[PDB]
Amino acid sequence: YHAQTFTAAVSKTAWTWLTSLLGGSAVIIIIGLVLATIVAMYVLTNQK
Amino acid sequence: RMVMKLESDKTFPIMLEGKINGYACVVGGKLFRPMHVEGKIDNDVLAALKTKKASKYDLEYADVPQNMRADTFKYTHEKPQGYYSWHHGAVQYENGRFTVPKGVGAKGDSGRPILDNQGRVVAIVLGGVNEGSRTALSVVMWNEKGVTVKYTPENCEQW
Amino acid sequence: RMVMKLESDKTFPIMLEGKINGYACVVGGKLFRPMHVEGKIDNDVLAALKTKKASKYDLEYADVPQNMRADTFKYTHEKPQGYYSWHHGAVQYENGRFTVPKGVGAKGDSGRPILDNQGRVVAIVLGGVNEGSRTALSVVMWNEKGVTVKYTPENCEQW
């Protein structure tokens, strides 16, 4: 009596896992880039 | 005359093709040799010594055995303006740059150390670029904090 | 004494219809040519260089080739009060101004580097004016931080 969508039956907890795993995937990458930029700047400042 | 008698046997040529292509130097308890030189150290004990790669600084460094730490070059962190001793001739440190007269220095001379008038190593060369009447050097030296600042001129020809 | 500051071949004339109207000088690996002077530098290698204008400071600068960087003037960030050497004659620094005797500097006497008592350039003069009974020079110097400050007297007369 209705019509379904591809995201209809995901439920909140599956959203929690999918966001934490994908978001955590991005957070660690962002941390890595931030650390790389910080150490690059620190090395450039070490040049006398 | 005054610049050539400052002779030290701590430097060791690298042997491959049966010809000289560079010098590796023991300074302050560490053996340094550039990327571009291939072969084995003349000293067998250092020839069999494992080296750790540092490509971005362009020098393999190796930990000398404790017995040989007594006889090694003394590193320097201060670089007063003016002329310095070398294997070939006087090297002028000016404007934070090491320069040598015309023609001095070519292929197979890489890795040689620049010392001071006191008699201790102040830097080590990895290549040279000809700027005209005076030739600039690609050289790595030591700071007061031991950060090992590397000075590489533009489009430097690699020795 | 004064003749030991005119053996500088690193300066270059500017030709216009076979006449001289200005001088282009190389300092610290950069070629400076006064903007108001029209013509072509006699040296072909420096003439072929493409220069970037600077209207505010009234001179155009270009980057010299690598092989020419060796033989080049050296600039100084300190300008102690008193005597200075110039090709035309003695110049004197008082209260931030260069002054010369009467009738010194005229048509075709711009771009001349004002050498110091040591023998290295401290500034480049672009023109001079004589107000009242004193003659002052419009000249661009270099500060300690390297901001290339220019001092120009009022109602400055070109060249």
Closest CA to C29 of C61, C59, C72: C72
Catalytic, B36? Answer yes
Q: Of the residues B87, B110, B116, B138, which is catalytic?
A: B110
Residue B110 is a catalytic residue = yes
Tell me the C-alpha distance between B95 and B100, whole Å: 14
DSSP-assigned states of every residue in C19-75: EEEEEEEEETTEEEE-SS--SEESSHHHHTS--B--TTTT-EEEEPPGGGSSS-B--
- Pair C73, C120: CB distance under 8 Å: yes
Helix (H, G, I), strand (E, B) or coil at A39: helix
Extract the tokens encoding B83. Answer: 């002329």
* Closest to C29 measured CA to CA, from B94, B83, B66, B25: B94
The amino acid that residue C81 corresponds to is: Q
Q: Distance from CA of residue B65 to its chain's centroid?
A: 21
The residues in C 49-88 lying below 8 A from B, measured between CB atoms, are: 66-71
| Touch between A and B (at least 3 CB pairs under 8 Å) | yes
3-state secondary structure of C123: strand
What is the spatial distance between Cα C87 and Cα C23, in angstroms, rounded to a whole number? 12
Query: For the purposes of burial, counting CB atoms within 10 Å of the CB of C72, is it exposed (0-12), middle (13-18) or buried (19 or more)?
Result: buried
Around C93, how many Cα atoms within 13 Å sit in the side-chain half-sphere?
20
| Cβ-Cβ contacts under 8 Å, A47 against chain B | 149
Q: Considering only the C-alpha atoms of chain A, give the largest distance between any 2 of them, rounded to a whole number of Å.
A: 75
- Reported in sequence order, the residue ranges of A1-48 that DSSP labels E, i.e. its strands, are none
Instruction: For residue B105, count CB atoms less than 10 angstroms from its CB and return exposed for 0-12, middle for 13-18, buried for 19 or more.
Output: buried
How far apart, in whole angstroms, are the C-alpha atoms of residue A46 and residue C12?
Answer: 40
Question: What was the resolution (in A) of this experimentally determined structure?
Answer: 4.0
CB of B114 closer than 8 Å to CB of B84: yes
Nearest 5°: phi and psi at C30? -135, 135
Residue with tokens 């009060």: C81
The technique is cryo-EM
Q: Tell me, yes or no, if C38 comes closer than 8 A to chain B by beta carbon.
A: no
Mutate to test the interface with C, among B131, B155, B157 (most CBs of C within 10 A): B131
Which residue has tokens 């420096």?
A: C46
User: Position B34: which residue type?
Assistant: P
Contact partners, residue C96, CB within 8 Å, separation at least 6? C151
Contact B24, B36 (CB under 8 A): no
Tokens representing residue A32 in the block: 């890595």
Is B96–A46 a contact, with Cβ atoms under 8 angstroms apart?
no
Min distance B151 CA to chain C CA atoms (Å): 17
Q: Kindly list the domain boundaries of chain C, sorted by start residue.
A: 10-73, 74-159
Query: Could you tell me the end-to-end alpha-carbon distance of chain C, in angstroms, rounded to an integer?
Result: 26
